[PDB]
Amino acid sequence: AELAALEKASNGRLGIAVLDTSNGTRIAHHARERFPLCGTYAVVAAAAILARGSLDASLLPRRILYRRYEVVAGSPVTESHVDTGMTIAQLCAAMLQSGDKGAGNLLMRVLGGPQAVTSFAHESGDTVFRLDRWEPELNLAAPGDERDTSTPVAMVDLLQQLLLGDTLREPQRAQLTEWMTGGARGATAIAAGVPPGWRVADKAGTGGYGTTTDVAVLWPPSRAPIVLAVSFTQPRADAAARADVVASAARIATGALTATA
Template sequence: MVVVPRTPSQSRALAVGPLLALLVTGCAVTPEVAPTTAGSPGSTPAASAPAPAPAPAPTPVPLPLGELEARYDARVGVHAVDTGTGAAVVWRDDERFAYASTIKALAAGALLDLVGVDGLGRQVPVEADDLVVFSPVTETRVGGTMTLAEVAEAAVTRSDNTAGNLLLEALGGPAALDAALAALGDDVTVVSRTEPDLNEAARGDERDTTTPRTLAEDLRAYVLGDTLGDEERAVLTAWLTGTRTGDTLVRARLPADWVVGDKSGAAGYGTRNDVAVVWPTGGAPIVVAVMSDRADRDAEHDDALVAEAASAAVAALGRG
């Protein structure tokens, strides 16, 4: 079935509250508690069964974003796919970009695949030596413990960097996440380092990089595919739709009543990224990845570039 999503504010209040409240206390989500239909309390777009595989995708249509790149003095890569028709719009979608914190969404998916909902109650210690720059949640928990659910939620919804590292540690380190993505069929993404080193984004360095196409395909596999079970997909979707870091990115120029679950990222060389699953009020979900950077190491990023590129991609798909 096609799930008709709630507005972003409704989705966040319903999806993130009751569901994560159970997880952070270490309780498993039972089928009776987990969202099951779009009309039930606490429902999320991931509550439906995985969308049926579309017909073979037509040849991707290039999205002319040269003017946008010139205006923002940046390089931008886009891959957007309508999961109902298989139509895709692309621009530099096979070029490498530093993935920055978008990797946290994939790490959360890999964690759910590894431990399941039942394993999210496991406690992990938070030590002072663990703290790295930008850790708004974990810095308040030093000397105590957090559940894996709390760690993953902090990493995805707040982009907490220490939580991101604890998430990688729970998986077995960067190499383990790299292997998990390879199991999805991803032979492009190179997971090498932890926060904050992964944000170096040095020119020509393939460490901690991926392509817009691969990033979109990986998130699609975790959120809309059958890699995860129903409960695990519902939890991941609740984290993504509950993010607090993406309001000025993919979702910024889309209709206000569409539900967007996303993970943003920023790094050196003006890197600014966002990867999202978008549930329009009608029709199948859209998966969008926008990645961007600039030539100078200390260049600032511009959220408006990502927002404009995403809006152009969705419009080119005939949606919105």
């Protein structure tokens, strides 16, 4: 199989799940095995914020003041706003569009920690997802470690519920979608493998062991969306990431759903 051959040629472990919402078709390769979330947890954390904010109108505009010396590396936006603080909405945008690690930690603190992100996934119907650690340790991606993992199929099903289901009210689904579409530093390897012209709402993740994990909703022109989750992780702690492998997996799967008969 083409996905299996790509995995073998790339010297690592590949997981992919796809759902074609036009007709229910699913594609699966290692879709029920755990892979590191890396920064894809941010989708769930932002969703949890939005759900709360639907009932607490003070939440999204609330200004968070935070300590400078505690902002972790990898925080280009939060580092720049230490003197003024940032609102919760601004933190959500920075986390999703810029992968700002300090923003992720600050929003997790607002929520009650990684365990609160997990709880929101669970109450939203995903009993597989688990976020255990803070930034940046949640991305260590050690082989065999079930912390900070989900499975590709669980990732697809949760992403579809959050962006296309009823967990969030429709304006909140639209806001989450917009945070995942905009930016320029906000694109996945998935996005490089999908046909140009398709609209993409995505969140990228990277970690140790040469890990890339990406989740996306894709809209081909004039067609119901395709939901997919892809992860690739490698045996060496010092392996270089392979964004090109994730892009290739996306190309293969999307092409399979665009075939005629």
